Amino acid sequence: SMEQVAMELRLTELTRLLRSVLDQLQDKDPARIFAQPVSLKEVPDYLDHIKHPMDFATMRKRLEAQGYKNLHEFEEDFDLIIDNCMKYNARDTVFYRAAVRLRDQGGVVLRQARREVDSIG
Ligand code: NA
């Protein structure tokens, strides 16, 4: 149907918006701390601590499969990246501090993304 193609243009346009949002969030991570999953070989206990690991490559695979149906789902994954890091790493560590800084800078991008997603539809 034509309706299913419109929905799909909508999902497609949301995806385009989420891709820009993603590339802008990932620019706020020059260290590339959040680019790939935490390695279970280098942190064998990780999954005892963190139940839903997240990282930007994993978010990107999902996005390219158009697996984000709204901004809320995308934000949920971005907050996992931050929140997992702040739980696993202590408050004085470079990792923890990078997540706080990513969060603060990410908020600015996301506050406008929410406006575009309502505004465009
Ligand atoms: Na902690």
UniProtKB/Swiss-Prot annotation:
Subunit info? Component of some HBO1 complex composed of KAT7/HBO1, MEAF6, ING4 and BRD1/BRPF2. Component of the MOZ/MORF complex composed at least of ING5, KAT6A, KAT6B, MEAF6 and one of BRPF1, BRD1/BRPF2 and BRPF3. Interacts (via PHD-type zinc finger domain) with unmodified histone H3. Interacts (via PWWP domain) with dimethylated and trimethylated 'Lys-79' on histone H3.
Which residue range or ranges hold the Bromo domain?
A: 9-113
Q: What does this protein do?
A: Scaffold subunit of various histone acetyltransferase (HAT) complexes, such as the MOZ/MORF and HBO1 complexes, that acts as a regulator of hematopoiesis. Plays a key role in HBO1 complex by directing KAT7/HBO1 specificity towards histone H3 'Lys-14' acetylation (H3K14ac), thereby promoting erythroid differentiation.
- Expression sites by tissue: Highly expressed in testis.
Protein location: Nucleus; Chromosome
The cross-link described as Glycyl lysine isopeptide (Lys-Gly) (interchain with G-Cter in SUMO2) comes at K41
Please state what the protein is called: Bromodomain-containing protein 1
